[PDB]
C-alpha cells in the first residue's frame with residue numbers, strides 16, 4: 001500500500017529515479033510489469049555465450065551519467081574491437097577502409113557526401129535540444145519526412161543510399177516513416193553525425209563487462225523488496241488526496257506522487273482518473289517505436305581479424321538481411337561473435353522465417369562480405385525480436401512521424417497533476433539511449449524533490465562531470481570540409497564564370 | 500460470468516454485432532467502458548436544442564446497412580437543407596454558387612482543379628477496397644504523404660489550397676500527417692470524390708430524426724441487461740479452454756469467442772495473454788485518430804435562407820476557425836442552427852480557449868461570410884471536443900501515417916486465435932462512418948457464426964439491398980471533365 005513515490009517501470013530510467021529518491025530518504029516502490037528488471041536492456045546468461053546483451057549495449061564518450069551510475073554500482077567497460085579494417089559493402093562488392101567512414105573518391109560524389117553530413121549538422125544547430133519545436137523552421141522541417149529531405153539534399157544516388165542506411169541504423173525506421181525535424185533533433189542531441197555514427201570517440205566505443213542488464217539488477221539489489229516484479233500498472237486515480245495506483249493482480253498502491261518511467265505510447269495500457277488532458281491523450285497514440293531484431297552469430301575464432309578486418313561491416317542493398325555489424329568477441333578474446341541488426345521493414349519481413357533460417361541467411365551474407373568460407377561455420381546463435389514485446393513496443397526508441405513533434409512535442413515531459421515523466425524519450429542528451437534513461441530518471445526524481453520543498457528549482461536539471469575513464473575527444477572539421485561547395489553551389493560557380 | 504460471445508465496446512459496430520448474434524440465438528454480453536452506449540455518436544437532449552448530434556450524424560445514398568438497421572429500430576431520416584445557394588469564401592469575399600462544387604473561372608486554374616479531382620478518382624480505381632496494400636503502386640503511394648502528392652499534382656496555389664481543405668475535412672488530419680495511399684483508398688471506398696463530398700446524392704444528404712445516438716440506445720433496449728456500462732476491458736486471457744475477459748471494476752467474463760469493437764489503437768488499453776503476435780503488437784501503436792471539435796450555433800431563425808443561402812459555407816484560409824458548415828436546423832424550420840467543425844491543428848490551437856471565446860470567433864466568422872449582423876446574436880451554443888475522449892482517441896476515424904498501411908494494413912481484421920475484429924476501421928465500404936461500423940460488426944459476428952459451424956464461408960460477407968427511402972443516382976462526368984488536359988499537358992501542347 002503506502003509510500004512517498006510510486007515508480008512505474010523498472011528499466012534503467014525507473015531504477016535510476018528510484019535510487020535517487022531512496023538515497024534522499026524517501027520511501028519508494030517500483031512496479032515492474034515483467035518477471036525481471038532492465039526493460040529494453042536484457043543480458044542473457046548461459047554456458048555457450050557466458051553473457052550477451054540482446055537489448056541496449058553500447059556506451060561511449062559524452063554519456064557521462066550512465067558511466068557514473070555504472071561505475072558507482074561497481075561495473076567496468078571495455079572497448080569494442082576496431083583495431084583492423086572496417087568494411088563498406090555496396091553493389092555486391094566489399095571495400096576495406098580505416099578511419100571512421102568510407103572514403104569517397106569521385107570528386108562530385110565527394111562534394112555531395114561532404115555537403116550532406118555538414119548540412120545535417122548545420123540544420124541541427126538550429127534546433128534547441130530541450131525544445132526542438134522552437135527551431136525557426138520547425139513547422140517546415142516537421143511537415144516533411146526524412147525521405148523528402150534526402151531527395152532534396154542528395155545530388156548523387158551514392159549519398160542518398162548511405163544517408164538512408166544511416167537513418168535506418170540510427171532510428172530503426174524507414175526514411176519515409178520519420179519527421180525530418182525529429183530526426184535532425186535526434187542526431188543533434190546525441191552531439192552530431194560523427195559522434196552518433198562512431199565507434200572510437202562515439203556512441204559505440206564500449207560495452208559493459210558482464211552486460212548492461214547488471215545496471216538495473218544491481219539497483220534492484222540495493223532497493224530490496226521495494227521492487228515488485230510482475231506488477232503491470234492498469235489504473236491511476238488522482239481524484240483523492242493520495243494518488244492510487246492499481247496493478248493487474250489487483251494490488252493497490254497509495255503514494256504522494258508518481259513517476260511514469262515507461263515508453264510514452266505504453267501509457268495507453270493505463271486507465272486514468274480523471275482522464276488525461278487532450279494533448280497527452282492524443283500524443284500517446286501518435287508515437288510508435290522502431291523495429292529491430294538483434295542477432296549474434298558465434299564462431300570458434302574471430303577469424304575476420306586474421307584477414308585484417310575488425311568485424312565492423314556497413315552493408316548496403318535490399319537483399320542483405322543485416323545492414324551493420326560489430327565484433328562482439330569477449331574482451332579476453334574468446335566467444336568469437338558477430339553482432340548484427342535486422343532493421344525496420346526487414347525486421348517485419350524476416351520475422352516470418354525460423355531462427356535456423358535467419359542464421360543461415362546471416363552466415364551466407366557474412367561469408368560473402370568477409371570473403372570467408374569460415375563464416376559458414378557458426379557454433380552458436382542468439383537473437384531477440386523486440387517488435388514482439390508487449391512491454392517495450394519495439395526498439396531502440398520512439399520515433400515521431402511527420403507533424404507530431406511540433407503539435408504534441410511540448411507535453412512529453414509536462415507533469416499531469418502529480419504524475420511526472422521519466423523514460424529515455426524525455427531526455428535532452430542521448431534521448432533513445434541508456435544515457436538518456438538516467439538523465440530523465442534523475443530529472444523526474446528531482447522534479448518531485450522540488451515539489452516537496454526539499455530542493456530549489458535551479459536543481460531540477462543537473463550538469464554531469466565528464467568521465468575520467470572515458471574522455472571525449474572533440475568533434476573537429478578541416479577547412480576544406482567547412483568551405484567546399486555543395487553540388488548546386490559548384491553549379492552556380494560554373495554558370496557565374498560563364499560571363 | 501458465462502456466455503458464448505463477449506463484445507468489447509458498445510458503439511454502433513459492437514451493438515450491430517451483438518444484435519446479430521442475439522438474433523441467432525447465442526448468449527452475448529457487451530462490455531462498454533463509458534456510462535453510455537454510442538461511442539463516437541452521441542445525441543445530447545435539452546430544452547434549448549431539443550436534440551443534437553455532437554458526434555457522428557450524416558447518412559446518405561449507398562450507405563444501405565446503417566439505413567436498414569435504423570429503419571428496423573423505428574428511426575426515420577430527413578434531408579439536410581441544400582435548397583438555396585452554397586457559399587465559397589475566398590480572399591475575404593463570398594461567392595455564392597449553386598450545384599455541388601465551387602466554380603473556378605481562370606482557365607489555367609480551371610484545368611488544374613479539374614485534373615486534380617479526376618486524378619484522385621483515377622488513382623483510386625487501381626486500389627482494391629478490401630486490400631489497398633495490393634494496389635500496383637502500393638509502396639510508392641504509401642511512402643509519400645498527401646502533402647507531397649498535392650505538391651506534385653497542383654500547378655496552382657488555388658487548387659492546392661482547396662485540395663488541402665478537402666483532405667482536412669474528410670479525415671481531420673493535415674495533408675503532411677497522412678499516407679497518400681491510405682487517403683486515396685479512403686475516398687475510393689466511399690465511392691469517390693463526388694460521393695464523399697456531396698450533400699444532395701452523397702454522404703451528407705441526411706440525418707436521423709431525433710439523432711443517431713438512438714441507434715445504439717435502441718439496440719441496448721433490445722438487449723436488456725446484456726449491456727454492461729462502465730466496464731472497461733483491461734485483460735484478455737486466451738491460454739485456456741474458454742476466453743477470459745476481465746474489466747476494471749474487477750468483474751470476470753468467460754466466453755467461447757470475442758469481438759473487439761473498439762478503435763484499433765484502443766487495443767493498447769488491454770493487457771493480453773498470450774502476448775499479441777508481433778505485427779498487431781506494433782500496428783496498434785501506429786494508428787492515431789484525427790482531431791476535431793464539433794460546434795453548433797443556434798439562432799432564433801434560419802435567417803440565411805432569406806438571402807437565398809442554404810447554410811453551407813466553404814471558407815478558405817488559415818485565419819478561419821472552421822472551414823466548412825452545414826445548416827443544422829430541424830426539418831420543421833425550428834431550432835435554427837449552423838454546424839461547423841474545427842479541424843486538425845486548428846482544433847489543437849483553439850482548444851486552449853474558453854467555450855464563450857470559441858462562440859465569439861464562430862459568430863464573427865459567420866457574420867462575415869453570410870453578410871449578416873444576425874449571425875452576431877446567437878441564442879444557444881453546443882460543442883464537443885473529441886480529442887479529450889479517453890475511449891475514442893479522436894474523431895472521425897483512424898488515419899494511417901506514411902508507410903503504415905502497406906506494412907501493417909493486412910493485420911487490422913486478421914483474427915487473433917478466438918478474437919475477431921469489428922469497428923468501422925475494418926470495413927471495406929464507408930470505413931470511418933456509421934455505415935462502416937455496421938458492415939464490420941455484422942461481418943465479425945458472421946466470422947464467429949462460421950467458426951461455430953452454423954453458416955458456410957460464402958456467407959461471411961453479405962451484400963445489402965438498396966434502401967427504398969434513400970436511393971442512389973449515378974455519379975456522372977461531362978465530356979470536357981474527362982478530356983481537358985492538365986496544366987503540364989497544356990504546356991506539352993505548347
Ligand SMILES: *Cc1cc2c(cc1C)nc1c(=O)[nH]c(=O)nc-1n2C[C@H](O)[C@H](O)[C@H](O)COP(=O)(O)OP(=O)(O)OC[C@H]1O[C@@H](n2cnc3c(N)ncnc32)[C@H](O)[C@@H]1O
Nearest residue numbers: 009011012013033039040056057058233395424432433434
Ligand atoms: C531494444 C534495444 C535498445 C537499444 C539498443 C538495441 C536494442 C535492440 N542499443 C543500445 C545501445 O547500444 N546503447 C544504448 O545506450 N541504448 C541502446 N538501446 C536503447 C536502450 O536500451 C534504451 O534507451 C533504455 O534501455 C531505455 O530505458 P528506459 O528505462 O527509459 O525504458 P525501458 O527500458 O523500456 O523500461 C521501461 C520498463 O517499464 C516496464 N513497463 C512497461 N509498461 C508497464 C506497465 N504498464 N506497468 C509496469 N511496468 C511497465 C517495462 O517492462 C520496462 O521494464
Ligand SMILES: *Cc1cc2c(cc1C)nc1c(=O)[nH]c(=O)nc-1n2C[C@H](O)[C@H](O)[C@H](O)COP(=O)(O)OP(=O)(O)OC[C@H]1O[C@@H](n2cnc3c(N)ncnc32)[C@H](O)[C@@H]1O
Nearest residue numbers: 508510512532538539555556557732894922923931932933
Ligand atoms: C466524433 C465524430 C464522428 C463522426 C463524425 C463527426 C464526429 C465529430 N461525423 C460522422 C458522420 O457525419 N456520419 C458518419 O457516418 N460518421 C461520422 N463520424 C464517424 C462515426 O461516428 C464512426 O465511424 C462510428 O461512430 C464508429 O463506430 P464504432 O462502433 O466502429 O466505434 P465507436 O463509436 O468508437 O465505439 C467503440 C466503443 O468502445 C468503447 N470502448 C473503448 N475502449 C473500451 C474498452 N477498453 N472496454 C470496453 N469498451 C471500450 C467506447 O467507449 C465506445 O463506446
Ligand SMILES: CN(C)c1ccc2nc3ccc(N(C)C)cc3[s+]c2c1
Nearest residue numbers: 169170196197312313314324325396
Ligand atoms: C559499424 N558501423 C560503421 C556503425 C556505424 C553506426 C552505428 N550506429 C549505431 C547507432 C545506434 C546503435 N544502437 C545500438 C542504439 C547502434 C549503432 S551500430 C553502428 C555501427
Ligand SMILES: CN(C)c1ccc2nc3ccc(N(C)C)cc3[s+]c2c1
Nearest residue numbers: 668669696697703811812823824895
Ligand atoms: C458543404 N460542403 C460542400 C461539404 C463538402 C464536403 C464535406 N465533407 C464532409 C466529409 C465528412 C463529414 N463527416 C461528418 C464525417 C462531413 C463533411 S461536411 C462536407 C461539406
